[PDB]
Design a protein around this ligand. Structure first.
Ligand code: CL
Ligand code: CL
Length: 162
């Protein structure tokens, strides 16, 4: 198991524009297009991202390519983030994947705000961090996914994903 497989399980894969759990236009493997309520605005962001007149449909390869860029960006955003970097540097490989998942979902800014959970993770207080991570809108809105990431941080294994 690895980050790609992990997120592929959490996000799924859709070849046409769809709305995410927040009602935002998305495509592929969780690639947000726009937070705007306009389908056209989403179609426009889509063609801009792929580099062709898509008409709101992409292929599998195109989706995978958006995915690769998105995962790379997340890692790189973590590394440039003063609050995130040290946590990531402190963790083992499995757990690093859980932090990446969260950043991919919520953005760097969103994650850097889990101040308290961040500190606990950094100190390797697994059970306490899991409890703290759960008192969040994130957990209340997407409980199953959140539970999987939380267990990953708690255990350091991929069990939640097998
Ligand atoms: Cl893009
Ligand atoms: Cl969920």
């Amino acid at each position: 198991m690895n980050i790609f497989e992990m997120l592929r399980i959490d996000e799924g894969l859709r070849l046409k524009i769809y709305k995410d759990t927040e009602g935002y236009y998305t495509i592929g493997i969780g690639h947000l297009l726009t937070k705007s309520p306009s389908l056209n605005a989403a179609k426009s962001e889509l063609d801009k991202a792929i580099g062709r007149n898509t008409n709101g449909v992409i292929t599998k390869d195109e989706a995978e390519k958006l995915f690769n860029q998105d995962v790379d960006a997340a890692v790189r955003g973590i590394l440039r983030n003063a609050k995130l970097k040290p946590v990531y540097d402190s963790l083992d490989a499995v757990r690093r994947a859980a932090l990446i998942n969260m950043v991919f979902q919520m953005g760097e800014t969103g994650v850097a705000g889990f101040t308290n959970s961040l500190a606990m993770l950094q100190q390797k207080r697994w059970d306490e961090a899991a409890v703290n991570l759960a008192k969040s809108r994130w957990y209340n809105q997407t409980p199953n996914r959140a539970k999987r990431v939380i267990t990953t941080f708690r255990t350091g294994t991929w069990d939640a994903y097998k």
